[PDB]
Amino acid sequence: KSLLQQLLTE
Amino acid sequence: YFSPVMVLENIEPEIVYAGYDSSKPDTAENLLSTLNRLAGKQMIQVVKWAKVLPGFKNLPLEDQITLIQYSWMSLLSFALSWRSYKHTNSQFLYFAPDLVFNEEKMHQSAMYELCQGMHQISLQFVRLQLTFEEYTIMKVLLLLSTIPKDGLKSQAAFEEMRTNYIKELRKMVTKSPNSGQSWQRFYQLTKLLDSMHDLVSDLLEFCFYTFRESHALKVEFPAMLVEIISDQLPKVESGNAKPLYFHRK
Ligand SMILES: Cc1noc2c1-c1ccc(cc1)CNS(=O)(=O)CCCc1cccc(c1)OC2
C-alpha cells in the first residue's frame, strides 16, 4: 500500500 | 444528492508551521527544501480533509487517489492565495506563520516570476472580496478539476459530485449581489478557477524539473511528495491529464 492508500483507508 | 458549505467551513485544515530555520543561509536549495517539507505536511492535511468531504467517500478509492494526485498543486496554491489574502491583505505570500515571502525571499528561492503569478491570484481575492464560503466551495471544485484523458473508473459518480458543488457555488454567490444580480459574480469565480490551470501548469513544470535534478540542486522532497510526483510526472508529461474548464480557451 502507498502512503495515499494507507491514509485514505485507515 | 445532499448544509454542505457549513461542513466545508468546519473541516478546513488548521494552519501548520513550515519549520523554517532562519539561522541557515537563505539559498534557493534551503528555501525550496523548507517549502517541500511544508507541502508534504499540508498534503497529509489535504488527504484527511478529502476523507470527510461530503460526497468524496462515494467515489472509488482509485478515483480518490487519482483526484488528489492531479489536483495537489492546485489545492496548495489556492490555499496559499487564501492565507496571503486573509493574513496580509495579499501584500505577501503567507506560506506559514514562520514563512512569509517578501520580494527578498521570492528572489532568493529562484522562483520570482512564479511567486508573482501566485501573488496575482491573491490580488484577485482582494478585488473580488472573496468570502470564506466561496473559497471553501471553490477549493472542492479544484480537487475535481483535473481527470485522466480516458476518464475516471466511476465517471458518472464524479460528474454528480462535481455538478452538485457547482450548484452550491451558484447558490452561495446570491449572498454577495451588486441591482440584486449575482450571475456576474458566478462568472468572475469560474473565470478565476479556470485561470488556476495555467498558473498550476507553470508551477508543475518547475516542480518536475527540481524533482528530476533534486540532488544536483540540493533540494529535498518528503516521502508524500516523492510518491505523488513519481505517479503524476509521467502522466502529466505524456498528456494523460485532462484539465476541466468551465469556459474553454
Ligand atoms: C507549501 C506550499 N504552500 O503553498 C504552495 C506550496 C508548495 C507546493 C508545491 C511544492 C512546494 C510548495 C513543491 N515544490 S516546488 O514546486 O519546487 C516549489 C514551489 C513553491 C511555490 C510557489 C508558489 C506557489 C506554490 C509553490 O504552491 C503553493
Side-chain angles (χ1 to χ4, degrees), chain B residues 2-231:
Chain B
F2 292 119
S3 170
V5 193
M6 189 37 75
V7 166
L8 300 189
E9 291 177 280
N10 293 313
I11 66 166
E12 189 58 19
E14 61 162 41
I15 184 151
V16 296
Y17 301 108
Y20 170 58
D21 188 345
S22 59
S23 84
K24 289 263 268 287
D26 284 334
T27 61
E29 58 273 23
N30 287 340
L31 290 175
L32 295 172
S33 288
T34 299
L35 285 173
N36 290 351
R37 172 165 68 256
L38 173 67
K41 301 188 222 82
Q42 290 177 343
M43 284 312 305
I44 293 166
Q45 300 184 298
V46 165
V47 180
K48 295 190 170 186
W49 163 84
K51 276 177 86 174
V52 291
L53 201 58
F56 195 73
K57 64 143 201 295
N58 302 158
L59 315 178
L61 176 67
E62 193 187 322
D63 290 349
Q64 283 180 23
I65 289 159
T66 295
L67 292 168
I68 293 165
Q69 289 173 325
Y70 278 129
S71 71
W72 77 284
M73 185 68 85
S74 296
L75 296 182
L76 295 190
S77 299
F78 201 65
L80 166 65
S81 292
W82 177 263
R83 291 190 300 277
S84 297
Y85 165 59
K86 196 193 176 200
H87 303 297
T88 76
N89 196 229
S90 306
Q91 284 176 44
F92 309 109
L93 292 183
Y94 194 101
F95 284 100
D98 57 335
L99 186 63
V100 178
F101 269 37
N102 51 6
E103 295 276 329
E104 172 72 1
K105 292 200 157 65
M106 287 169 62
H107 288 293
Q108 296 176 311
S109 68
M111 296 191 298
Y112 190 77
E113 297 166 301
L114 290 163
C115 283
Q116 274 290 317
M118 182 88 271
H119 177 236
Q120 288 302 307
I121 297 296
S122 69
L123 288 178
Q124 297 300 307
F125 286 21
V126 170
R127 183 186 147 255
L128 296 166
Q129 290 292 284
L130 195 73
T131 70
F132 185 62
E133 304 99 286
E134 285 165 343
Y135 161 72
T136 65
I137 300 158
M138 291 167 80
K139 192 150 55 51
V140 175
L141 293 169
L142 289 176
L143 168 66
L144 305 176
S145 284
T146 316
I147 62 173
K149 189 173 93 278
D150 306 303
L152 294 165
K153 294 297 273 178
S154 293
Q155 188 64 29
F158 163 79
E159 289 184 5
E160 185 178 55
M161 182 184 180
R162 184 164 159 95
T163 300
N164 279 293
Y165 279 95
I166 296 160
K167 295 182 179 164
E168 292 303 322
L169 186 64
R170 188 64 185 91
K171 288 182 201 173
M172 199 49 63
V173 295
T174 74
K175 297 186 184 184
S176 289
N178 58 356
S179 300
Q181 309 185 104
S182 62
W183 61 264
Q184 295 112 134
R185 192 163 180 84
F186 179 71
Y187 290 113
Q188 285 179 135
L189 304 187
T190 57
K191 177 174 185 179
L192 185 53
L193 283 165
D194 279 0
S195 81
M196 286 304 293
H197 286 304
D198 288 345
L199 162 78
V200 168
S201 179
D202 289 345
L203 291 167
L204 288 171
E205 188 189 346
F206 182 85
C207 176
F208 296 164
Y209 174 84
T210 70
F211 193 74
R212 269 203 174 92
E213 327 260 345
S214 106
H215 109 97
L217 300 164
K218 292 213 168 188
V219 181
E220 305 179 285
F221 287 86
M224 278 287 297
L225 292 212
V226 173
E227 174 174 301
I228 291 156
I229 303 153
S230 295
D231 272 319

Side-chain angles (χ1 to χ4, degrees), chain A, chain B residues 47 51 61 64-65 68-69 223-224 227:
Chain A
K1 278 189 172 180
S2 70
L3 294 172
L4 237 64
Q5 285 176 313
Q6 290 178 40
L7 288 167
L8 285 162
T9 59
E10 64 185 27
Chain B
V47 180
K51 276 177 86 174
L61 176 67
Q64 283 180 23
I65 289 159
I68 293 165
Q69 289 173 325
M224 278 287 297
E227 174 174 301

